[PDB]
Each structure stands twice: as C-alpha cells, then as structure tokens.
Amino acid sequence: DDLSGFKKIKLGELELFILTDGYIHEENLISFAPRGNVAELKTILKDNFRADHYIDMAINILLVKTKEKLILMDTGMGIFADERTGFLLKSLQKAGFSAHDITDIFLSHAHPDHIGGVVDKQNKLVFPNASIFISKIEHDFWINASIKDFNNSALKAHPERLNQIIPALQNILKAIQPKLKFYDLNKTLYSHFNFQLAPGHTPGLTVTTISSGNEKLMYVADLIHSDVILFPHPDWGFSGDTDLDIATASRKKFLKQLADTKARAFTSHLPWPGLGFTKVKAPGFEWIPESFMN
Amino acid sequence: DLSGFKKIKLGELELFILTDGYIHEENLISFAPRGNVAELKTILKDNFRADHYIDMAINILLVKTKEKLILMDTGMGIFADERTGFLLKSLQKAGFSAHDITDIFLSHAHPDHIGGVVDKQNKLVFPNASIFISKIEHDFWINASIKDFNNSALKAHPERLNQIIPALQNILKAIQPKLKFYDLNKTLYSHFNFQLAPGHTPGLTVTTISSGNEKLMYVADLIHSDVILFPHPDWGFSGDTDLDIATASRKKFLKQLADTKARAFTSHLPWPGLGFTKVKAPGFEWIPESFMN
C-alpha cells in the first residue's frame, strides 16, 4: 500500500539516496514506442518474463547530500499523483529528511512526473528553503507552449489532455518563479555538478553529471523509458517525447557515450533502483543493471 | 548496518525476503573449480562487475501463513564476520522478533545457513521454533570425514574441514530436541513441498512454496553466480561437496525452471534473489525479477 522507500549509496565524498515516488502503470502499449513493432515489443516483454499488456515505469529520484547542500533531482508527480504515485515525501522521511532540509532542486525537465512535487494543490511551495533550477530553454518552451508544438509527438493524438496539462504546468512555473534559477551549462556547480542539454524528449531536457574523485554518475532522466525495449531499439521512440526525431538523436548520442565510456547512469523510469551500465549489442544497446547485496 | 527486507505477496501468503549480509570472496582462483580465472574475469568485466572479487548475497525467506511464521535458513549466526550475521536486525525491520518464529526450514547444514539457529553458548536463538532438515543432510554431517570431500575443491583445505565438521556437528547436537526430518512426499502446512537436489551437500533440499495460483521455488545453493554459473554450470562452486553430482543437479533444476518459466528464490544471487531462468545454449541465463521499489 505504502510504496515509499529509499536506498543509500556512497559516491566518494557524497552520500546519495535513491528515493521512489511510486510507479506509472502504463496500459496503452500501441503508442508506448510509436515507431516500433508491436508484436516484437510484446515478445521482448515476455522473453523477460514480464507482463505483455502493460509496462510499469518506476519514478526514481536522486537525493545528493554534499558537504553543505542537500539536493533533490526532480520531485515526482506531486499534484498530478494517483494512488500509485506521490510517495516522494514519505520516501524522503524514511531516508531521514524533511522538506525544509532541501537546499536545491534540480529539474531535469518540466513534465508532470518531474515537476509535480514542487507545489501542493493550492500552488504553495513544498520545499521552503530550496532554490529550483531548470534550463532556460525548458522554461522558455513551457511558458509559451501550445498544441501546435506537439505535431512531432505521439501526444498530438490527445489534444484535450494537452490543453489540460499545459496550463497546469504553466501555473506551477508561475508559482516557483521566486525560487527559480537557470542552469549554467558551462560551469561546475557546488564542485560536483555539471549540466548539459539532451533535447527532444522536451526542448530543454537536462542531463546532470555528479562527480567525486574518480567516481562519476550521470543522471539521464528521461532519455530512455524501457530497459528491454528502447536500448536495443532506440529509434522506436517514446509516447511522451515532444519531438520524436530529435529525442531519438539525443538518445543515440548519450547511449553511445555511456557505452564508450563505460559510465554508470541513473534513470528516472527504469526498474528500481534505476542504476546501471550501457553496452553495445547489435542492433543497438543493452542495459546492464547494477547488482547489489541488499 | 547491512540489514534490510523486502515484502512481497504470494497468493494469500506474506513473504519477507531478509538479508544476513554478504560474503566477499576476494580470491577468484577457488571460486569455480572447473572454470578458469581469465574467462571468469572476462564475464565479470562484460557485466560491469569488479573483476577481482565476487560478492555473494545471503538472502533468507520468511513466510507468514495464516497460523505460522516460517524462516527458511538462518544466515551465518555464530560464524558471522563483520559483513554477516544481520538476520535478526533484518527480521526486526520486517516487524518480527525471534520469539515469533514457529518453524525453521534448513535447506542444508552449511555455516551460512545453519549458523543462526544457536548463539555462542549453543542456546537456541528461536526458542519457539521447530527445525526441519532432510534426514540425508543430517546423517551426512553427523558422520562426515575428510575423505567424503575427495570430489570437492574443499579437499585442498583439510585443516578447515577439521574445524568446520565438528562445529556443524555441535550445532546439530544443540538443536536435536527441536529437529524434525522432511517428508519428501507430503505437502506441509498447506503450502510447502520438499525435494532433494544433492551435490552441493548430499541432502540439499529445494522448497516449493505455493498459495492460490502462485508458486515460488527456493533453490538455496543450487547456484552461486548469476553471470558465471548460468552460462557455465559445469564450472562448479568451491563449496560443493561433490562437484559432479552438484553439476548434474544444477543442470536438472535449471532446465526445469527454464521449461516451466517458474520463478526461483536463491540464497546467494544479487538482492533480492528472485528471478527467472532461460535457455541460452549451451547453458542458461538468469533474468532477475524487475521491481518498482
């Protein structure tokens, strides 16, 4: 019933806490990977002993405790939560923290399942002491977004949904304006964090690298939404991508980079705890989850 | 603090996977006696694992039925090092004390499974629990000698065997008054069925847990590495009492799991030890169960 939880890991100087907001039970598989083969999609699910009539997407969130900061990377569904989501604050509590402890929030992008937790249902800030970072491009996009921005998206099939969600996101952006900062894409922040754009899923989707000594972790957020489908088939796309073609280009760039460098990634939506490695495997890539003893 | 638990549902049953900690094997030469370190290291690197040690989990299953609370194996207990012996802390996190346990099912009598049944004064840790073991397993360790290990990698360590055998015998003596032998031909407590998978030890017992439409197979020490011993089950494991019999059992039960697409629970594969088996000729592949939390 209570879907909250955390996992603590060490990253050199840093303490990391992986938090869960819950999960998304996606039952509409015809458009999950819009450019894919729906027979092959279900074969892959069954070859991995999973259900073939839905895909459960995790909502994994990273909390980073540095020497003087406590940083939350994304905030889950918040006001958009259903009964399977909105567990972030319970997870944070289990990890030993309350909302007032958070000093900084890094938003990877402004989708409902990432920005929803920054306010409550009266548009009041949840994290009273936190600066909130977003890319300038991401902000610029959503404050003026409309239906016609989604013509290269599977979402174009849902204009009524879009016409609901866009003003809701705009209202959140208005509420957080007094806390808002834009990433500097060319400077290290707080000694540990570097930011770069990976456009396509949204125009300003930001990937964060966390560094301590010879340890690096890349939070790639919504670059990829399925371990078993979109690593071998990155050109199949994802239902929520704002621009399918541009999202495919970013997905391929970062998968290639993760494979070439053997770097560990943290992901929003792959199975818990969302940590793993990327290898080339014709005709695409393969996700190798990190292994744990507990 | 390496303690922790995961709760899952199986039909009407509540299952809690508990950790005792982990075993850090820092020398790869002994790990898979009929393999080789170059090929082993290649597999570890190919899976982004450390290439100079292997960590083995110690996963333990707690089953809450409508009238009983069953612990399947007990971790290192009196044999614990700094990374093991966390079972009671995990049990507490899951919501239970030692006094709550009604039954313990031992898969086999190795130190990392039977060590937790007594304390260092050889007093029972679980005062209200019956303890089950296979008759063959019991009779082996009561009567074992060094020569019985001549088809084990453990034959390289006769001093260690001469310490371990009496230590295990002392535990078997302490739990004697609570000890029952499995009936391999009947369902116990409406949920449990037992069968042997000899070789790792002569009386290694595999337990099937069932409720409603669901079944889970606790295969205990059938297999010790997900990435090594599924593709190469004939490489063996350092702790197997008889390497040839253990290989045959390993291949038999991996084939059954593959053919039936059944879920297994394992003592030593990465946390939480749950997963599926697929043929990947000439061997197998482990597909860990995927979770949202």
Ligand SMILES: [Zn+2]
């Ligand atoms: Zn998104």
Ligand SMILES: [Zn+2]
């Ligand atoms: Zn998302």
Ligand SMILES: [Zn+2]
């Ligand atoms: Zn054993």
Ligand SMILES: [Zn+2]
């Ligand atoms: Zn064992």
